[PDB]
């Protein structure tokens, strides 16, 4: 019957890794030659920015990151002092495939390698606090194995799609998943709805518009809410 403490100001950092420019995925990595630049991802980054600033998080945007950069950014957050924070959010917008996300330079980063950097042992100042990841990306090429996060408690990963499949991005409106997620958080958090309940609503909205099926994976052990001013 408990809820994660969510009262500090700011609540925590909301890292946003936004990948748009995939030139090298065609200039340095032979197989993604037809990989299109992610038009519309900027609207997504802006929606996430305004959604979470309203929810009192400190936004830390980073655009066009190669896999090496993603790792160094994540490493800096792993080492930071979160002792005065109640939560940590990391959003990753990019191209992807089965269980992984692509850096702009076409290199790969297994989602599990990213999330597991924040276990209690590795990032003590977030031990016992919710670590939330939102990833907009494809997870294969099927259109209609990894377990993504550690088994220890307090992780929430919101994926735009089940593994092996794609997710859609409307160049003029943003991605289906991120746009739906932000709209629901903005409308529902002020009403006291918990984040998992919100994600089920997102599963529903996105699945109603091929079809796309989002999928939360998590080890949360308390109700998660983002109290809205």
């Amino acid at each position: 019957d408990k809820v994660y403490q969510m009262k500090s100001k700011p609540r925590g950092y909301c890292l946003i890794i936004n990948n748009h420019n995939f030139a090298k995925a065609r200039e340095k990595v032979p197989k993604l030659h037809s990989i299109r630049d992610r038009n519309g991802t900027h609207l997504d980054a802006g929606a996430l920015t305004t959604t979470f600033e309203e929810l009192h998080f400190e936004i830390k945007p980073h655009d066009d990151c190669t896999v090496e950069q993603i790792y160094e950014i994540l490493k800096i957050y792993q080492l930071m002092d979160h002792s005065n924070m109640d939560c940590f959010i990391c959003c990753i917008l990019s191209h992807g495939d089965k269980g992984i996300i692509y850096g702009t330079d076409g290199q790969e980063a297994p989602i599990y390698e990213l999330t597991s950097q924040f276990t209690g042992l590795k990032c003590p100042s977030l031990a016992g606090k919710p670590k939330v990841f939102f990833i907009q990306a494809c997870q294969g090429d099927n259109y209609q194995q990894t377990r993504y996060i550690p088994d220890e408690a307090d992780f929430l990963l919101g994926m735009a799609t089940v593994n092996n499949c794609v997710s859609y991005r409307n160049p003029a409106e943003g991605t289906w998943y991120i746009q739906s997620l932000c709209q629901s958080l903005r409308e529902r958090c002020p009403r006291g709805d918990d984040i998992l309940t919100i994600l089920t609503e997102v599963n529903y909205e996105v699945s109603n518009k091929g079809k796309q099926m989002p999928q939360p994976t998590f080890t949360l052990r308390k109700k998660l809410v983002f109290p809205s001013d």
Binding site: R36, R38, N39, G40, S94, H95, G96, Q136, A137, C138, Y143, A160, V166, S167, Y168, R169, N170, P171, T175
Partner: peptide, 5 residues
Amino acid sequence: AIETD
């Protein structure tokens, strides 16, 4: 055009 990621 509706693009896949």
